[PDB]
Design a protein around this ligand. Structure first.
Ligand SMILES: O=CNCc1cc(COc2ccc(CCNC(=O)CC[C@@H](NC(=O)CC[C@H](NC(=O)CC[C@@H](C(=O)O)[C@H](CCC(=O)O)C(=O)O)C(=O)O)C(=O)O)cc2)co1
Ligand SMILES: Nc1nc2c(c(=O)[nH]1)N[C@H]1C(S)=C(S)[C@@H](COP(=O)(O)OP(=O)(O)OC[C@H]3O[C@@H](n4cnc5c(=O)[nH]c(N)nc54)[C@H](O)[C@@H]3O)O[C@H]1N2
Ligand SMILES: Nc1nc2c(c(=O)[nH]1)N[C@H]1C(S)=C(S)[C@@H](COP(=O)(O)OP(=O)(O)OC[C@H]3O[C@@H](n4cnc5c(=O)[nH]c(N)nc54)[C@H](O)[C@@H]3O)O[C@H]1N2
Ligand code: SF4
Ligand code: SF4
Ligand code: SF4
Ligand code: SF4
Ligand code: SF4
Ligand code: SF4
Ligand code: SF4
Ligand code: SF4
Ligand code: SF4
Ligand code: SF4
Ligand code: SF4
Ligand code: SF4
Ligand code: SF4
Ligand code: SF4
Ligand code: SF4
Ligand SMILES: [Cl-]
Ligand SMILES: [K+]
Ligand SMILES: [K+]
Ligand SMILES: [K+]
Ligand SMILES: [K+]
Ligand SMILES: [K+]
Ligand SMILES: [K+]
Ligand SMILES: [K+]
Ligand SMILES: [K+]
Ligand SMILES: [S]
Ligand SMILES: [W+6]
Ligand SMILES: [Zn+2]
Lengths: 129, 80, 341, 190, 430, 116, 129
């Protein structure tokens, strides 16, 4: 299903980053996708099921969550973080600021696992120096 | 009886109820002006360790203003 | 028997009926009851918050069904019936004296009181004249001269002109088959005839030369109705009426006393007030300051709900006299006397 | 979003006039025996005809006695960039210089020191605590405008301005400042 | 137990200065008045990595080194680099930011703060059209109409509404009852749930809505019968609400800096606020994110003339966001080394920028374990400003408040680390 | 006239036309005495072009009125006279000037446009 | 879920009754409930899954089917037959004609089996005579 990806803050993702981005708390708060209940039923998924998000720019696995802040029809919400930033639009249009918000993505259910914080970062393949 | 009840695990610590309450406002000029109390005062509830914390439930008149001010239903008027 | 939020207490025949939707949570029934059978929930909570409890709870094991609470209730929310007619019609039972009436011959159907009524107890109807009957003229369109350019239909400010547009076909090689003026809608302003590029419209306006005879002076009719159970006698209609056709008398006399400095403007009493007595005046110009909590006791009935709702008791209600039918029971006299302050 | 006009026009709510503010603070200035005098940026800055508001302003603290505990100051009023307060006329098109009347007031009076605020005929930037004036300037030249009102204390505004020598108004303002330097006889007052 | 009062909170741009810290031993064990986020920073979460010493990655494995070695290796990286990026700054104090400007000068570096991923577009806009603001106290005591445009303060500035909207002010004694609250957001956020007016407009269409609003405001007719999903009629009803204000404040945030148009969304919003002042007093405040993002832009501006995206490569300061911004240099592969301080671009930059961080030396002055430290070559832990170190911070509307030192730490402060880094960068260049 | 635009089986034709404004084909005076006005709403209802607007409200003790203002939009008014006849307190002064002054005050309409 | 039950014809049920109501064909054509695909998603069921229909008057198990004749929101279709007639309204309002159409029912997924034709009739418990 093609949806519009919106990203930003959450009181829980703020609590998590100031508690520790190495903690499980952070995966639970930021490695998620918020959806309207009708959209979850349209996709055939329940809270706790995982979703594969793919865009022109990347892909990520996040845990589906029912939005307590209702979304417009066709929109989903991933909190700011490295999972969301696998998939949002990097280009700045010569402003220095990327397009973190409102990005066309494709979402589909998946049985793959959510990558924890250090495992997610290895996707970028850091070479020492 | 109907009384004030806190749900701290849903709470943001935002302070709207603390400021909105007239009893708190009446006793603490800083709370009336939107600040957390720095003076020692006895008021109905405070934000403590990041969440709403009821300290003097006997002063609560069950008017309902705090409830109107909470967007996440973390403070309510219900039985017990 | 409790169904939904309503409460009926039965003994066999006497029946006390409580109507939640009519209860303003003023508390007076609880105070006057000789057997302390009534406990009234917090006024603010019941008005401002969602609750599944009823506004009142009555203990039937102590209730002796004397009917003083039903008498005192200013909002018609408690009614006791005896075999099985309401005591509101029994002369032996004391009644509080109140009234609200509209003189239908004086009333001009402006609907101000319908709008002002804090309880929506008033219905005002009025039948206006039809538009054609306040206007006069002639208008005809010569359809063969008409080339169906649509300009008159567009310019007509009341959409009185209609054109039967179509897509042409070889069988019907025209862009329209008819044009009409709805004289029920035409107000004879003349715009169409002036914009018509081919002078196909004949229109003559007669209002000024023939208005005195051709147009009848409008008689506006209607009626009024005050719902006696929704009505609470605040007096807004009496005060709002431009022709003093409305008359209201109240049950209680008293005083309103407000402490502006104790008041912290939580707005509870404002929302609680069933008579629209209390308000937060908006400052008229920048830098100007207002009375924190403004009252107008002309609309006040001294039911006491605001005082009860205020968590800092910044608002207090006094009550000097309760106007009633003659009281002969001395139990009744002292309970009515106990509500005076 | 308003302003005061003249020294007898009170602010909303507070109901005190400019004249009373200037006098009272001059009084405070010497009662605490400050080294420097009150430092006055007048009302009605930069508007045609304001020279009368300026001259009236100059008289308000004249009857206050200077009293520095440190230093040698013998004046109670310091008026700043008064070129901007020396305007005649009534609109920008009948706009004329009134620096002679200003300079001559200074010559005759011993309680005032001024600075001129000389036009340099550059593209520069204006920045003042005179919020309402800067919004008016932005209204005139249409250029980018910044503002900051500080709670209980003051306001401020910032607007670029091009003082082009070829333009009539900057030309006159350049002259007004030169007139002030030169028609004031005693340099110890400027 | 000890109660330390009047503490300034080191998280978001609200910069609350009425925090009570509960101190047991030499440790902060609780708070009063701080919101859920502010509390989480002050107190340690169990199991959370707090680096005790510097670390360096030797090929593939981190090893603890001393301060002098870590600083030495970092100084050589920057000295030998021909396009170093010095990024972050927003979560430390101003004197450390000042040392950073001097160090970027010495290294010929590009210095840049989180503004480049945040309210940078507001900086670009205010440089073009203006900046009509006020301080919190004028809002609390005067504000008649309060707008939250593309910001969600209940989740991102949790105490912002309680202090500026529900607060009872001088001309607004009734607090919330004296104010019309407007929120503009495509989601029904918890902030929007409290609003009197919620314009639930179409995403990425703020620029169009603001164009209709401004044309209407200046007396013109609105071309289309619906804009940004809002029908014509309510565009006009909204402009009348703003025109009839006695004092209006427009709070705006990421919903229009990150959205389509970016800096031009702020541009059109500012100019409407400007033009509204012919009918009603109006002002705006950008909801600056970190407690001291504003402080860096102040320091960097007054020392160099430019607020962010500052390039010292030529000696002279030069400034062109879109070329000299953190994401520009990383995504176009211009930067050949990167020093991060008090920020987490590993978590919070896009994929394309992280791909470049994988290829270059990354230095991280950071107390906690983060996605950036997972991409770092040198890790240098500091004392935390606002808890273990003091210094100047700047609130979102420019108000300066000094951060307090509540408990002691054996670690060095950001300032000391940067001054040692600066001394030995000079040593190498000589 | 746009007949060909409608008739074209290929939608190849664009016909534009600018018509005169309504205000310019009509002339009169209208004034509402708001002190006499008691806000019965009857003129607002009967006005066939919705030119009259009333700022309705619920009364409060601070503002004990059912409306705070009433206005006539002369860009819309075509001076039919209905409101003035229905007003129960004669608070509306209205006179049409078409017949005495129409030659001078109403310009004959020029209709402009293009084709493509 | 509360829905509106509508009943009537389909050529497949017409073919079936003239082929034989004792046939498997008849269960497939008449022991079904037609639903909009959006309603199936909201209920979490797919074509071929069984549904328990309950009304004031009876209950029945039928096979869920995707309606190719679109229904109004909130309505379902069971073809005329003994399954549909387990649940529709029997009262004739003194007309002799029952209310076969537009009856409030409750539908819920079920793993129970669809009753074939002779087994369905046994619930009425025919006594010989
Ligand atoms: N802490 C203190 C502080 C200080 C500051 C700084 O603030 C200030 C405050 C105030 C300003 C100044 C305000 N800005 C302006 O006036 C802009 C221009 C103004 N226009 C004019 O004046 C128009 C004149 C024009 N006249 C001509 O063109 C005459 C031509 C003659 C000829 O050809 O010789 C012609 C002669 C023809 C012939 O020869 O016969 C003639 O005379 O008419 C006209 O036609 O009207 C406008 O556009 O409004 C600046 C900064 C900040 O903070
Ligand atoms: N809990 C927590 N709090 C924080 C932070 C954190 O990480 N966590 N970080 C801090 C930082 S750095 C910052 S900058 C601030 C940011 O504070 P905010 O400016 O609130 O940032 P966001 O939450 O990203 O975005 C706010 C809203 O913009 C909306 N939005 C999205 N697209 C559009 C659009 O097209 N139009 C409009 N009008 N709105 C749109 C989103 O729905 C969202 O509700 O928060 C700070 N506070
Ligand atoms: N998808 C998406 N991505 C986004 C955004 C979005 O809305 N959506 N928002 C963007 C925005 S606005 C921003 S600002 C960024 C977030 O900007 P970041 O700077 O990445 O935000 P934090 O993760 O809070 O990083 C602050 C770091 O500083 C550390 N720190 C705290 N105190 C001190 C100190 O005294 N000294 C030092 N050296 N370090 C300290 C903290 O441990 C923390 O790791 O995210 C951006 N990325
Ligand atoms: S209820 Fe009325 S009183 Fe009891 S707390 Fe919430 S507000 Fe203060
Ligand atoms: S309760 Fe609702 S309001 Fe009072 S704090 Fe917790 S959240 Fe903010
Ligand atoms: S009195 Fe009439 S109204 Fe006041 S409470 Fe008892 S019942 Fe409800
Ligand atoms: S009945 Fe007589 S007793 Fe039973 S309640 Fe109403 S009053 Fe109190
Ligand atoms: S108000 Fe006076 S007049 Fe207007 S209606 Fe109600 S009663 Fe008849
Ligand atoms: S305008 Fe003259 S022509 Fe065009 S339609 Fe109306 S009438 Fe026929
Ligand atoms: S006259 Fe005025 S109204 Fe009667 S039709 Fe021609 S236009 Fe429409
Ligand atoms: S009195 Fe108060 S209530 Fe009874 S009618 Fe006149 S207004 Fe409606
Ligand atoms: S009075 Fe008691 S209640 Fe009515 S407002 Fe002032 S405080 Fe809130
Ligand atoms: S005001 Fe007069 S009426 Fe409105 S409540 Fe207080 S008392 Fe009952
Ligand atoms: S609000 Fe921003 S600042 Fe005030 S506390 Fe919660 S976080 Fe620390
Ligand atoms: S051509 Fe000009 S006129 Fe002849 S039809 Fe097409 S439009 Fe009407
Ligand atoms: S009619 Fe006469 S009175 Fe009734 S509203 Fe229009 S004007 Fe005011
Ligand atoms: S005149 Fe005819 S048109 Fe002009 S206003 Fe009164 S009614 Fe509406
Ligand atoms: S003047 Fe009187 S008559 Fe002549 S037109 Fe205008 S209205 Fe019809
Ligand atoms: Cl919790
Ligand atoms: K609530
Ligand atoms: K028309
Ligand atoms: K004509
Ligand atoms: K009256
Ligand atoms: K100020
Ligand atoms: K922490
Ligand atoms: K055509
Ligand atoms: K009408
Ligand atoms: S930020
Ligand atoms: W930010
Ligand atoms: Zn000045």
């Amino acid at each position: 299903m093609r949806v519009i990806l919106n990203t930003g803050r959450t009181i829980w993702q703020g609590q998590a980053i100031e508690s520790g981005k190495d903690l499980k708390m952070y995966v639970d708060a930021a490695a998620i996708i918020q959806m309207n209940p009708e959209m979850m039923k349209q996709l055939g998924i329940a809270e706790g099921d995982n979703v594969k998000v793919i865009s022109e720019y990347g892909d990520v696995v996040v845990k589906a969550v029912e939005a307590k802040e209702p979304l417009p029809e066709g929109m989903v919400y991933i909190p700011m973080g490295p999972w969301a930033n696998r998939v949002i639009r990097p280009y700045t249009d010569s402003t220095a600021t990327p397009s973190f918000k409102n990005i066309p993505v494709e979402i589909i259910p998946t049985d793959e696992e959510v990558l924890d914080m250090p495992t997610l970062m290895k996707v970028y393949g850091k070479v020492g120096q | 009886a109907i009384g004030l009840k806190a749900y701290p695990e849903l709470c943001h610590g935002c302070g709207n109820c603390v400021i909105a309450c007239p009893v708190n406002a009446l006793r603490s000029p800083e709370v009336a002006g939107g600040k957390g109390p720095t003076d020692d005062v006895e008021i109905i509830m405070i934000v403590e360790d990041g969440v709403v914390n009821i300290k003097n439930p006997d002063l609560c008149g069950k008017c309902g203003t705090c409830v109107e001010s909470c967007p996440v239903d973390a403070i309510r008027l219900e039985e017990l | 028997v409790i169904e939904g939020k309503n409460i009926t207490v039965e003994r066999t025949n006497r029946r006390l009926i409580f109507q939640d939707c009519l209860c303003a949570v003023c508390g007076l029934c609880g105070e006057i009851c000789p057997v302390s059978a009534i406990e009234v929930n917090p006024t603010g909570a019941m008005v401002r918050t969602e609750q599944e409890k009823s506004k009142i709870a009555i203990d039937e094991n102590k209730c002796v069904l004397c009917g003083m609470c039903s008498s005192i209730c200013p909002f018609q929310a408690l009614d006791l019936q005896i075999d099985g007619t309401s005591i509101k019609e029994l002369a032996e039972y004391p009644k509080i004296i109140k009234s609200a009436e509209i003189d239908d011959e004086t009333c001009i159907q402006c609907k101000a009181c319908e709008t002002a009524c804090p309880q929506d107890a008033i219905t005002i109807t009025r039948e206006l004249p039809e538009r054609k009957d306040l206007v006069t003229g002639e208008i005809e369109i010569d359809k063969d001269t008409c080339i169906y350019c649509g300009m008159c239909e567009e310019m007509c400010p009341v959409d009185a002109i209609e054109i039967d547009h179509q897509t042409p076909s070889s069988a019907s090689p025209v862009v329209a088959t008819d044009i009409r003026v709805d004289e029920d809608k035409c107000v004879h302003c003349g715009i169409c005839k002036r914009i018509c590029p081919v002078d196909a419209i004949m229109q003559v306006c007669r209002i000024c030369p023939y208005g005195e005879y051709e147009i009848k002076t409008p008689e506006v009719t209607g009626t009024s109705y005050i719902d006696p159970e929704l009505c609470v006698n605040c007096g807004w209609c009496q005060e709002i009426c431009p022709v003093d056709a409305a008359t209201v008398t109240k049950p209680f006399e008293g005083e309103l006393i407000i402490d502006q400095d104790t008041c912290q403007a939580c707005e509870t009493c404002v929302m609680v007030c069933p008579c629209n007595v209390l308000s937060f005046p908006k400052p008229e110009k920048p830098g100007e300051k207002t009375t924190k909590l403004h009252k107008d006791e002309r609309f006040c009935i001294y039911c006491g709900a605001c005082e009860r709702s205020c968590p800092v008791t910044a608002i207090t209600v006094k009550r000097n006299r309760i106007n009633t039918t003659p009281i002969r029971s001395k139990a009744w006299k002292n309970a009515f006397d106990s509500l005076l302050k | 979003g308003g302003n005061v006009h003249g020294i007898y026009d009170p602010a909303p709510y507070f109901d005190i006039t400019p004249a009373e503010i200037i006098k009272g603070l001059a009084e405070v200035n010497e009662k605490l025996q400050l080294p420097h005098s009150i430092h006055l940026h007048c009302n009605d800055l930069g508007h045609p005809g304001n020279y009368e508001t300026t001259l009236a302003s100059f008289d308000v603290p004249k009857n206050i006695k200077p009293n520095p505990a440190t230093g040698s100051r013998d004046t109670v009023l310091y008026a700043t960039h008064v070129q901007f307060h020396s305007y005649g006329g009534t609109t920008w098109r009948d706009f004329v210089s009134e620096a002679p009347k200003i300079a001559d007031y200074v010559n005759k009076n011993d309680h005032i020191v001024i600075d001129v605020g000389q036009i340099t005929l550059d593209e520069t930037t204006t920045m003042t605590a005179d919020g309402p004036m800067e919004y008016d300037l932005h209204s005139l030249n249409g250029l980018k405008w910044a503002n900051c009102d500080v709670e209980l204390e003051t306001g401020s505004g910032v607007v670029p301005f091009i003082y082009s020598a070829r333009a009539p108004v900057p030309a006159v303002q350049w002259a007004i400042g030169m007139e002030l330097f030169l028609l004031i006889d005693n340099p110890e007052k400027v | 137990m000890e109660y330390v009062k009047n503490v300034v909170c080191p998280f978001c741009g609200t910069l609350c200065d009425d925090i009570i810290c509960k101190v047991e031993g030499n440790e902060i064990v609780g708070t009063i008045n701080a919101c859920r986020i502010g509390h989480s920073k002050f107190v340690h979460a169990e199991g959370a990595m707090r680096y005790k010493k510097p670390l360096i990655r030797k090929n593939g494995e981190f090893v603890e080194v001393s301060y002098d070695e870590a600083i030495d290796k970092a100084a050589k990286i920057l000295a030998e680099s021909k396009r170093p990026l010095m990024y972050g700054w927003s979560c430390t104090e101003c004197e450390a930011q000042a040392v950073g400007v001097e160090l970027a000068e010495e290294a010929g570096a590009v210095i840049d703060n989180t503004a480049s991923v945040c309210h940078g577009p507001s900086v670009l806009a205010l440089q073009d059209v203006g900046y009509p603001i006020c301080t919190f106290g004028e809002v609390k005591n005067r504000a008649d109409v309060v707008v939250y445009w593309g910001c969600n303060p209940m989740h991102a500035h949790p105490r912002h509404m309680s202090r500026n909207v529900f607060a009872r002010g001088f001309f607004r004694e009734r607090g919330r009852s004296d104010r019309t609250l407007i929120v503009v957001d495509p989601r029904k956020t918890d902030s929007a749930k409290l609003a009197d007016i919620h314009l639930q407009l179409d995403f990425d269409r703020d620029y169009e809505l603001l164009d209709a609003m401004r044309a209407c405001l200046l007396g013109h007719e609105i071309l289309y019968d619906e804009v940004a999903g809002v029908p014509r009629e309510q565009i006009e009803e909204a402009v009348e609400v703003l025109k009839n204000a006695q004092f209006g404040i427009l709070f705006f945030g990421m919903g229009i800096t990150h959205s389509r148009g970016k800096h031009r969304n702020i541009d059109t919003a500012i100019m409407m606020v400007q033009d509204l002042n012919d009918y009603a007093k109006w002002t705006l405040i950008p909801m600056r994110g970190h407690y001291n993002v504003t402080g860096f832009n102040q320091v960097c501006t007054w020392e160099s003339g430019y607020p962010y995206c500052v390039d010292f490569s030529g000696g002279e300061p030069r400034y062109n966001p879109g070329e000299t911004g953190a994401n520009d240099l990383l995504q176009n592969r211009e930067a050949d080394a990167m020093m991060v301080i008090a920020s987490d671009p590993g978590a919070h930059f896009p994929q394309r920028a992280l791909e470049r961080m994988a290829e270059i030396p990354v230095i991280a002055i950071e107390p906690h374990r983060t996605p950036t430290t997972e991409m770092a070559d040198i890790i240098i832990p500091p004392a935390i400003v606002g808890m273990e170190a003091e210094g100047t911070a700047y609130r979102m509307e420019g108000v300066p408040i000094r951060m307090k030192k509540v408990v002691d730490s054996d670690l060095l402060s950001d300032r000391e680390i940067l001054e040692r880094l600066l001394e030995k960068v000079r040593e190498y260049k000589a």
